[PDB]
Design a binder for this molecule. Structure first.
Ligand SMILES: CCCCCC/C=C/CCCCCCCC(=O)OC[C@H](COP(=O)([O-])OCC[N+](C)(C)C)OC(=O)CCCCCCCCCCCCCCCCC
Ligand SMILES: CCCCCC/C=C/CCCCCCCC(=O)OC[C@H](COP(=O)([O-])OCC[N+](C)(C)C)OC(=O)CCCCCCCCCCCCCCCCC
Lengths: 277, 286
C-alpha cells in the first residue's frame, strides 16, 4: 500500500542523514585531540551519534509492511518502537550530561565516567519500562469485526466495522509512562539549559540545542501520536509524517551540536596556517 | 453513586484549601504596601490565587455524578481546570521573566511599553490560547454522552473469541486530538517555564526568585496529569477511586504551588515586623 515514490524519497533522505551522521562520527574520532574538538567532549558525542543512527534505523523500519520472511509484525512494531526509545534516550543523555558538567564547573568546581554512569542509569530506566511493557502485554495484532448500536437518547444508529490494528490491551498506560518519563527528563534538561545560559560559546554551551530539541521532540511526538491514532487509513501519510519527524528532529539536533565544532575547527586551522607562514 | 464518606472528606479538604487561598488573598490585599509583599508581585499573585480558586471549584464539580446537562457539566469542569492552570502558571512565568530581564539589561533597553506588553503577553496570550482551543473543542467536537450496545467477534492468529459489552461514557469523537493539543501547548509553555526557572536559578531569594516553585509545579503537574488521564481512561468502573484521585491531584498541585509562593512571604513579613518592633521598643526605652 506504500507508494514506491514515497519509499524512494524517504530512503534517500534517511540515507543522506546517515551519511551526515557518519561524517560527524569520522570527524569526532579522527580529530579527537584537537583543542576545539577536545573541549566539546568528543567521547560523549559518540553516544549521541550512535543514538542518532539508531533513530534513523527505526525510521527505516517504520516503512515496511506485512512480514520480512514469514515473520511477525508484532516483533517489528515492538523492535522499531523500542529502537526509537533507546535512540532518543542515547541522543538526549550526553547533551544533558555536558550541560550538567558545565554548570558544576561554573559553580564550585567531573570526569566522563560519572556522566556515562548517569546516562547508563537513564538507559536502564528506559530498558526497564520497555521490558515490562513487552512482558506484561505484547502488541498482538487482532482482527476486530463487530456491530454496534449507538443510543444517544435521541437517535439510533447501527454501524458494522471490520478493523485491524496492532496494539496493546492497555496501550495508553504505556504511552503515558514513556512520554511522562521522557517529559520529566526534558523538563530537567530545559532547567539545565537555562542554568548554563550564556555561560560559554555554543561549542561548549549546549543550551540552544536543548531548547530546540525539546520543542521539536514535543511537537513531533504529539503530531505523530495523533496521526497514528486517527489517520490509520492513510499509510502513506503516516509513514511520510513519521519519517519526516524523526529525520527533522535527529538532523536538527546533530547539526546544532556539530556545525559550531566544524566551523570553529576550520577557523582555528586557518589561523594556524596564517601564523605559520 | 459516590460514597458520602469520601464526598465529605474531599469536600472538607477542598474547603480547607479554599480557605487557605482566601487567607493568602487577604494577606496580599491588606499588606500590599509592605516591603516584603511589594518586592514580590502582589497584582500577579492575585491572578494566581483566582486560578487556584478556579481549580478548587473544578475539583468540587468533579464529584457530581448521576444528578444532572451532564455533557455541559463535564465541559465546564474541564474548561475550568484548563483556565485555572493557565491563570496559576502564567503569573509565575511572568515574574520569572521580569526578574530575568531586570538583571540582564544592556545598552539596547528597548522600550518600557514593549517590556510591559511582553509581560502582559506571557499571561493573557496563554489564556487566549487556551480559550480558543476550548472554544474550538466545544464548537467542533462537543462531549456527547452516548450508550453503545455492541457484540465483538475478534480473532487472534489461532483463537476465536466473542464478547458482548454495553457501556455508557461521555467523550468527544476525536477526544485524543484535543488532549494532545492541550497537553502539547501546556507542555511547550511549561518547558519555557523550566528554561526561565533555570535562567533565574540563583538570582535572588525564594520570595522573589520563583525557580523552585516552577520546578516543583511542572513536575507535579506532569505526574498528576499523566496519572489522571490514565485512570480516567481505564478505571472508569471505579467512580470513587477516580473522583478521589482527581480531587487529590488537583488539591495537592494547587496547595503546593500556593504554599511555595506564599509561605516565604509570610516568613519574611514576620521577620521584618519583628525587627521593626525590636527597634521601636529599643528607641522608646531610651
Ligand atoms: C530525537 C529523535 C526522536 C524523536 C522522534 C519522535 C517520533 C515519534 C513517532 C513515534 C510515536 C508515535 C507512535 C505511537 C505507537 C504506535 O505506533 O502504536 C502502537 C501502540 C499504540 O497504538 P495506537 O493507540 O497509537 O493505535 C491503536 C488505537 N487503539 C484504539 C486500538 C488503541 O504502541 C503502544 O502500545 C505504546 C508503546 C510505547 C513505546 C514507546 C514508543 C516510542 C517512543 C519514541 C518517543 C519518545 C521520546 C519523545 C516523547 C515526547 C516528549 C516527552
Ligand atoms: C494547578 C492545579 C491544576 C492541575 C490539575 C491536573 C489534573 C488534571 C486532571 C484532569 C485530566 C484528566 C481528565 C481527562 C478528560 C476526561 O475527563 O475525559 C473526558 C474526555 C475524554 O474522555 P476519555 O478518553 O478519557 O474516556 C473515554 C475513553 N475512550 C476510549 C472512549 C476514548 O475529555 C476530552 O474529550 C478532552 C477534553 C480536553 C479539555 C482539557 C482537559 C482538562 C485540562 C487540565 C490539565 C491541563 C494542564 C496540565 C497539562 C499537562 C502538563 C503539560
Amino acid at each position: 500500500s506504500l507508494s514506491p515514490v514515497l519509499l524512494g524519497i524517504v530512503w534517500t533522505f534517511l540515507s543522506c542523514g546517515l551519511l551526515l551522521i557518519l561524517f560527524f562520527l569520522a570527524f569526532t574520532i579522527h580529530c579527537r585531540k584537537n583543542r576545539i574538538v577536545k573541549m566539546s567532549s568528543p567521547n560523549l558525542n559518540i553516544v549521541t551519534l550512535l543514538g542518532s543512527c539508531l533513530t534513523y534505523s527505526s525510521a527505516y523500519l517504520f516503512g515496511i509492511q506485512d512480514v520480512l520472511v514469514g515473520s511477525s509484525m508484532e516483533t517489528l512494531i515492538q523492535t522499531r518502537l523500542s529502537m526509537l526509545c533507546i535512540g532518543t534516550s542515547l541522543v538526549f543523555g550526553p547533551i544533558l550530561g555536558k550541560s550538567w558538567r558545565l554548570y558544576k564547573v561554573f559553580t564550585q568546581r567531573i570526569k566522563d565516567l560519572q556522566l556515562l554512569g548517569l546516562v547508563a542509569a537513564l538507559l536502564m530506566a528506559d530498558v526497564i519500562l520497555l521490558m515490562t511493557w513487552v512482558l506484561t502485554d505484547p502488541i498482538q495484532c487482532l482482527q476486530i469485526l463487530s456491530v454496534s448500536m449507538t443510543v444517544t437518547g435521541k437517535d439510533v444508529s447501527c454501524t458494522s466495522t471490520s478493523t485491524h490494528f496492532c496494539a496493546s490491551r492497555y496501550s495508553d498506560v504505556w504511552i503515558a509512562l514513556i512520554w511522562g518519563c521522557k517529559g520529566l527528563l526534558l523538563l530537567y534538561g530545559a532547567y539545565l539549559a537555562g542554568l548554563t545560559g550564556h555561560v560559554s560559546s555554543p561549542p561548549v554551551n549546549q543550551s540552544l540545542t536543548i531548547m530546540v530539541g525539546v520543542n521539536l521532540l514535543v511537537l513531533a511526538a504529539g503530531l505523530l501520536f495523533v496521526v497514528t491514532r486517527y489517520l490509520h487509513s492513510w499509510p502513506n501519510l503516516v509513514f511520510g509524517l513519521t519519517s519526516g519527524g524523526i529525520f527533522v528532529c535527529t538532523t536538527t539536533i546533530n547539526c546544532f551540536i556539530f556545525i559550531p565544532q566544524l566551523k570553529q575547527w576550520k577557523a582555528f586551522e586557518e589561523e594556524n596556517q596564517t601564523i605559520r607562514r
